[PDB]
Amino acid sequence: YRYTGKLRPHYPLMPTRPVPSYIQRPDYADHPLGMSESEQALKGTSQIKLLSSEDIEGMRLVCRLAREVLDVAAGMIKPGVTTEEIDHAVHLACIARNCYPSPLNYYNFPKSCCTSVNEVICHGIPDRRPLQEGDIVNVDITLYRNGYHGDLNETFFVGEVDDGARKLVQTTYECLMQAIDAVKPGVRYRELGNIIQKHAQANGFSVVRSYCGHGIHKLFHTAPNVPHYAKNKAVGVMKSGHVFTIEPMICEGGWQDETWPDGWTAVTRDGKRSAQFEHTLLVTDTGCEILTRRLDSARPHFMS
Ligand SMILES: CCC[C@H](C)[C@H](N)P(=O)(O)O
Ligand SMILES: [Co+2]
Ligand SMILES: [Co+2]
Ligand SMILES: [K+]
Known part of the structure; x- marks a missing residue:
């Protein structure tokens, strides 16, 4: 494999983290290839669910908890922290909230969040690499609670970054x-x-x-x-x-x-x-309700 930039994976990965059995699990959690029977059974369907009031409440709650967990990760972003360290904190925060970390074993994804540094578009796997000053890093959080998933992500700056990193992140947000x-x-x-x-x-x-x-x-x-x-x-x-x-x-x-x-x-x-x-x-x-918004603060983390 010819890498496209400077990043490399930093192995080995820690052994997969368990979720206590009292936390309710999505279907794919226990499938050996992490396939989701419920998703597959609608593969190729363009029809969109109209959510009930109960469904709405359930999405409101899981999205709010997800936001909480993202904010935990946001707090951890600094030079020298590994992405695996972020992921361990996310995994504990999900469990604290009686939620399953949706990424874990989704199609055999090995971690509880996605960490995407610099040239990684998405779906980066938390590993042993420390964050470097000048990196940009996205953390993608998804929680599962009472049968509902809530999904959000933000890009963060690691220490001081260059003007191109500022413009890219600001434009993306916009x-x-x-x-x-x-x-x-x-x-x-x-x-x-x-x-x-x-x-x-x-x-x-x-x-x-x-x-x-x-x-x-x-x-x-x-x-x-x-x-x-x-x-x-x-x-x-x-x-x-x-x-x-x-x-x-x-x-x-x-x-x-x-x-x-x-x-x-x-x-x-x-x-x-x-x-x-x-x-x-x-x-x-x-128009719309932004389920994963911050409730306590006006702006995304990278502005603050
Ligand atoms: C491994 C599960 C992570 C999923 C694919 C991401 N939250 P997304 O849907 O790409 O935002
Ligand atoms: Co996501
Ligand atoms: Co998503
Ligand atoms: K990135």
């Missing part, structure tokens, strides 16, 4: 928020990528094509599929009661990705940096 601001009943899911790409391109960045936002609720990933690039062919129209994410990945160089031999870690083919933000959204009647 991309997400401009998309969110368009969400309301009657908007086609395919419109969001036009908005995102328009803002990225204006700032000289590209938009990753291989990974999309997604329906989420009883299923970790389900309909709708929400591309983040322009002129996509996404199926469906927003309706009050829909719950989904938006999670644009924006890059300094070109949009093309490839995957490491671990099967998960997605990197820019050119080795330039990428950044991402993610929220879980419920469509309302005004």
